[PDB]
Amino acid sequence: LPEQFRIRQAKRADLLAQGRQPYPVDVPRTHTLLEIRQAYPDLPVDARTGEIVGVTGRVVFARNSGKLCFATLQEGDGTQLQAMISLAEVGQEALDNWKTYVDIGDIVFVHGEVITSKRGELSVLADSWQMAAKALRPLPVAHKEMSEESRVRQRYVDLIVRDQARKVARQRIAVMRAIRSALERRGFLEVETPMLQTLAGGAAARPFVTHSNALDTELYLRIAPELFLKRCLVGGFERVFELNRVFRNEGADSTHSPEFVMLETYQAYGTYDDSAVVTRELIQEVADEAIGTRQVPLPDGTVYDLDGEWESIQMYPSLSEALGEEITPDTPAETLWAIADRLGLDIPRDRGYGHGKLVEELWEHTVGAKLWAPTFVKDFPVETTPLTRSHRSIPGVTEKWDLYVRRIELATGYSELTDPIIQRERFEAQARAAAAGDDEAMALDEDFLAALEYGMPPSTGTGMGIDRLMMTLTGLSIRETVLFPIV
Ligand SMILES: C[C@H]1CCC[C@H](C[C@H]2Cc3cc(O)cc(O)c3C(=O)O2)O1
Ligand SMILES: N[C@@H](CCCC[NH3+])C(=O)O
Secondary structure, X not given: OHHHHHHHHHHHHHHHHOOOOOXXXXXXXXXXXXXXXXXXXXXXXXXXXXXXXXXXXXXXXXXXXXXXXXXXXEOOOOOXXXXXXXXXXXXXXXXXXXXXXXXXXXXXXXXXXXXXXXXOOEEEEEEEEEEEEOOOOOOOOOXXXXXXXXXXXXXXXXXXXXXXXXXXXXXXXXXXXXXHHHHHOOOOEEOOOOOEEOOOOOOOOXXXXXXXOXXXXXXEEOOOOHHHHHHHHHHOOOEEEEEEEEEOOOOOOOOOOOEEEEEEEEXXXXXXXXXXXXHHHHHHHHHHHHOOOOXXXXXXXXXXXXXXXXXXXXXHHHHHHHHOOOOOOOOOHHHHHHHHHHOOOOOOOOOOOOHHHHHHHHHHHHOHHHOOOOEEEEEEEOOOOOOEOEOOOOOOEEEEEEEEOOOOEEEEEEEEOOOXXXXXXXXXXXXXXXXXXXXOOOOOOHHHHHHHHOOOOOEEEEEEEHHHHHHHHHOOOOOOOOOOOOO
């Protein structure tokens, strides 16, 4: 209500004018609420510990009584501790000022003795209090459920009233630190590649376009750091990774956010067989450090098993077994069109899709849509993997694996294409498909090609959406894993 806004304004202006400071520069804070609970786990009722402390906390519940005022204080992590304002300890005016100015939502400083109530509630028997932050907007009423849209628009309020919001936010922080600790112990170095690029590449997505005033030209927010992380391989970096933001200006839904966080690792003198092992162990180690179990709990009550080895299937024979028909890279595109036409699959015909795109959409409808447990699918068509090296022995296939978890693409990994001549052909075929109506096709990068011509060692690289890693570990939506998603 707007009347409650001016009521809290009058309390603030009256407090400020009368010499009291509703927003002081500091308060003699000596203890947190958490260390007081840990220092006194069990205490009998009516106990005077004698420990004189000075604590702070947001008032989330207040109960007025004649000579004794009760108030529940809550600090940042959710730890709670009761405040006791009695006439016998704070005096008359300090008691009356508490009833006059303190409202629910205010951040207050309370100095006193750690005691337990007659009911056994661990409290701080105050002898003097002070306003730390006079709140002008009251917190939502108790158990007034915040809508899903309100939780995003006001995450700061969501972190005060909902314990699930604090746990998920602290879980994401633990995941980001677990990824760094797990990669750094393997010899990987975290590097930084530019987010403002002159030509967006390294993935298949539409970029954000902006204007530079220093260069007087159009720049692009990066969709992937792949092309610049490959420059580090040519430069000498053997084990390198980047864990930061990427911008893909496309549609947003339950699994896509235009601004999101990725992980890209690159390991010299290793193949995609080695990167699939690192990615599996990394995810399993992140689950241990951030959740405490590889059988993670899901919001529906079920438990998802992430431990042990994971199934690895090849894409062409898995589609062959699912169809009951031999499908090879030699299978003509017209055959795959007729197979997709019989299956009722809707694939656009004005986009220049050929053999490679048809096998991908056929595998998803027959194999990918049925997976649930962590499963790798490897050996992809050459047309849909421009930055991936051809297979060492199987013709027509490339050395790329895809990691699906609960019907969600979590990670990918290539045996990196180091041949500059073949890489130029891949770019020519991509720009060929873009001229055929494929807006997702990549563009030829002369600067990246020139970097390859100096010699890039045989290496393997990975990519993983950290936001989808949070969805895998927690089961929450993609917007719930972000503190402030711009929606
Ligand atoms: C870095 C990549 C490679 C591994 C799979 C995963 C795909 C990626 C696609 C993608 C595109 C997009 O526009 C918005 C998004 O949030 C994502 C995402 O989370 O996942 O992450
Ligand atoms: N650039 C890839 C991730 C790296 C793949 C391995 N080189 C992507 O955005 O999907």
